[PDB]
Design a protein around this ligand. Structure first.
Ligand SMILES: CC(=O)N[C@@H]1[C@@H](O)[C@H](O[C@@H]2OC(C(=O)O)=C[C@H](O)[C@H]2O)[C@@H](CO)O[C@@H]1O
Ligand SMILES: [Zn+2]
Length: 747
């Protein structure tokens, strides 16, 4: 970590650091050179070094693939490993000979290397460049002049092959491949290295980083989450952190908003007791291999001295071979670790996310609930899933359906364009305009289509469903998808009885709607037999009554529908959770409850099924799901309200809680167990007096939402009960306890 000591100057109105005139300055500075001897003698890093020396042997000829993937180069072997270890050895011994061998071992091949086109080859080329930059900066004072010219020219030749182009003016700065290794590690590392001879490279690489990449990352960082889904969180957040470490070790301090520290807590909250991670954005599923965020936990953990993240890394302290050197140089072996068992049970991610993760524990019995507004969309690996909810408990119950890969293909698959990334795949809301079109001409890198299917979902923002170049372009465009209206959890911070969230998601949709709102209320019922519930209350106003509205609930197994009750079970893979939904609004007379699914109908989108069967032996628990429940109004209307109450329990639980709808003037609500929860009848702010009646035994906990913040008064049976309570602005809510009787609220 150290304090910045380089000189800053504005370039085109943007402050940027200037590389110091001194070597070493890549991945470390002179200041930390003498500390390598101890890292060699630190046993936890002994194995790491041992591993790298093993990596020195060449690929045995017959085992070389022939299709030279990025997977082939990231599994680094042979000469390039050797020269890195020579260059390191040169820092440690100062020995002219050791340094000169590194320079001549690498230089010929660096200027000659050829790279056959293959999947994400820029990764290979980029890592080759790193190898070169290490020798160049680490052995700078052993370089002959002719050699520097040779190296500079080799680097430029290699740069011109990178996908972002050289100059690096191509692709995207918030998402996409240019948001990965090519600029934040690879191009940056070389530019730093050759700055004395050819500063243009640094000026371009870091130019774009500070002008674009950084600005866009600092903007969302304060909310401690990431937008690329729970798989690509790995590569993308890793490359942010490479920039972090690189520039700090250059002498530029931490250039990112320090909130970066808390981003990976979101992964921790999503860990299932079966070793898997809660789904989101582009992911696949497995029950064979637990998922880890090894590199992010390492880099962020060690830089910010964070024990919760460090523990995360300690789960599987095995870094990909091309990164073993960065473990060795940057890993904090002194830093401690803690299990997550003592963290608060709910975490909130503010603008531009508006996301709640809610839990009932950290052990085998944990319910895990996710609630999402989405203020903006980042595209790429993010799905158009505004308003979506997800519930796991002893297995996935209320699912985030579909899968990234399968029989359909991968990123470019029909299944991606037409189901996976679309609203229909999610526990959200559909409003079907038969005449809506969805421009997709810019999506993906293969198999381009001008349009994608109509799923009655949210728009495809951007110029044909591509991400914007950067934050400026984003904000000037059409990527806004909603607004957080209210949020909170309490009354205790550690074990909140409820978790609350409300968003206006109207902007996610086309002019087909006038207003779309969703209020989630998750209750931690603090009880083994039935440990959680979630109330969802929606307002949908369409530009045309004849636009069919849908409410969706996805599952793995077939749901049973019995009147106003929906029962979903897990009976496979050792899961045994149960979700039961009580449909309160629309009421039985205006409600159509229908299931769709089974073979041929699992990825169904109005007349067409976007087949995506797993590659044999994968997704063994079928978490890409096979069934969904649709709730539609019988009666065509511009304005409809949905009110659904979910309960979680073991699929062996006979008796659950009875759910009563509460109807007052101005408000609509739900009573179950000892919880009372109310909403504005119109889902707009309540600013006049209102009331309702409670009937039932014992003490109740009340959460009244949609209130005008200020001082409310609470009466019961005509007499003052709480002369003055305060509804605050963030949640617009009252919380209090009370027994049965007839209530009035004054303001
Ligand atoms: C700008 C963004 O929409 N670019 C797309 C790539 O993300 C996508 O590549 C897939 O995703 C990734 C990755 O982002 O790490 C790696 C693999 O190359 C792909 O699985 C490509 C694929 O055609 O399309 C877009 O250019
Ligand atoms: Zn999804």
């Amino acid at each position: 970590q150290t304090k910045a000591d380089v000189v800053w100057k504005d370039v085109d109105g943007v402050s940027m650091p200037i590389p110091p005139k001194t070597h070493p300055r890549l991945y470390l500075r002179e200041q930390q050179v003498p500390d390598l001897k101890n890292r060699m003698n630190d046993p936890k890093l002994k194995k790491v070094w041992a591993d790298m020396i093993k990596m020195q042997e060449d690929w045995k000829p017959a085992d070389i693939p022939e299709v030279k993937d990025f997977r082939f180069y990231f599994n680094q072997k042979g000469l390039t490993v050797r020269v890195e270890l020579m260059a390191l050895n040169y820092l440690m011994t100062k020995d002219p000979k050791v340094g000169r061998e590194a320079i001549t071992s690498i230089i010929d091949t660096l200027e000659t290397a050829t790279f056959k086109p293959a999947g994400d080859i820029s990764r290979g080329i980029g890592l080759f460049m790193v190898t070169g930059a290490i020798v160049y900066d680490w052995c700078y004072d052993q370089l002959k002049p002719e050699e520097k010219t040779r190296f500079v020219k080799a680097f430029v030749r290699l740069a011109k092959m990178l996908e972002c182009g050289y100059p690096p003016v191509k692709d995207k700065s918030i998402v996409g491949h240019a948001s990965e290794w090519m600029i934040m590690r690879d191009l940056l590392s070389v530019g730093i290295a050759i700055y004395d001879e050819f500063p243009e490279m640094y000026n371009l690489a870091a130019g774009r980083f500070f002008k674009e990449h950084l600005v866009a990352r600092n903007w969302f960082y304060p909310s401690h989450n990431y937008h690329q889904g729970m798989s690509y969180l790995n590569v993308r957040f890793t490359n942010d952190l490479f920039a972090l470490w690189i520039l700090d070790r250059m002498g530029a301090g931490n250039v990112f908003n320090p909130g970066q520290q808390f981003i990976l807590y979101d992964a921790i909250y999503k860990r299932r007791p079966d070793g898997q991670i809660l789904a989101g954005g582009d992911v696949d599923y497995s029950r064979k291999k637990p998922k880890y965020y090894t590199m992010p936990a390492l880099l962020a953990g060690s830089y910010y001295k964070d024990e919760y993240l460090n523990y995360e890394f300690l789960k599987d302290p095995n870094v990909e071979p091309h990164c073993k050197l960065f473990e060795f140089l940057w890993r904090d072996t002194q830093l401690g670790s803690r299990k997550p068992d003592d963290l608060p049970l709910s975490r909130y991610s503010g603008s531009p996310f508006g996301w709640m993760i809610a839990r009932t524990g950290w052990g085998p019995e944990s319910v895990i609930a996710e609630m999402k507004v989405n203020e903006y969309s980042f595209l790429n690996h993010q799905h158009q899933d505004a308003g979506a909810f997800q519930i796991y408990y002893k297995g996935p119950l209320a699912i985030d359906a579909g899968s990234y890969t399968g029989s359909s293909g991968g990123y470019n698959s029909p299944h991606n364009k037409n189901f996976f990334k679309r609203t229909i795949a999610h526990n959200s809301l559909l409003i079907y305009d038969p005449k809506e079109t969805f421009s997709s001409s810019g999506y993906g890198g293969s198999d381009h289509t001008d349009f994608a299917a109509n799923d009655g979902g949210q728009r495809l923002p951007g110029k044909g469903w591509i991400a914007p170049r950067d934050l400026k372009e984003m904000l000037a465009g059409d990527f806004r998808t909603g607004k957080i209206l209210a949020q909170g959890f309490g009354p205790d911070n550690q074990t909140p009885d409820y978790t609350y969230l409300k968003g206006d998601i109207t902007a996610a949709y086309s002019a087909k709607v006038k207003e779309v709102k969703r209020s989630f209320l998750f209750l931690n019922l603090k009880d083994a037999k039935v440990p959680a519930a979630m109330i969802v209350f929606d307002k949908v106003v369409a530009s045309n009554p004849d636009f069919k509205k849908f409410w969706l609930l996805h599952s793995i197994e077939q749901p049973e529908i019995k009147g106003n009750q929906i029962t979903i079970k897990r009976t496979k893979n050792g899961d045994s959770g149960m979700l039961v939904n009580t449909a309160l609004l629309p009421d039985a007379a205006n409600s159509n409850i229908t299931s769709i699914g089974g073979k041929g109908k699992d990825f169904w989108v109005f007349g067409t099924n976007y087949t995506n069967d797993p590659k044999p032996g994968t997704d063994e628990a079928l978490e890409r799901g096979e069934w969904r429940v649709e709730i539609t109004p019988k009666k065509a209307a511009a304005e409809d309200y949905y009110l659904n109450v979910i309960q979680i329990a073991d699929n062996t639980q006979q008796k659950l809680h009875e759910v009563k709808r509460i109807d007052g003037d101005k408000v609509v609500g739900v009573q179950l167990a000892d919880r009372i929860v109310t909403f504005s009848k119109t889902s707009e702010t309540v600013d006049r007096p209102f009331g309702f009646s409670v009937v039932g035994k014992g003490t109740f906990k009340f959460v009244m939402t949609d209130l005008l913040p200020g001082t409310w008064q609470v009466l019961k049976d005509g007499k003052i009960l709480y002369p003055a309570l305060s509804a605050k602005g963030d949640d617009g809510a009252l919380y209090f306890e009370g027994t049965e009787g007839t209530y009035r609220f004054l303001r």
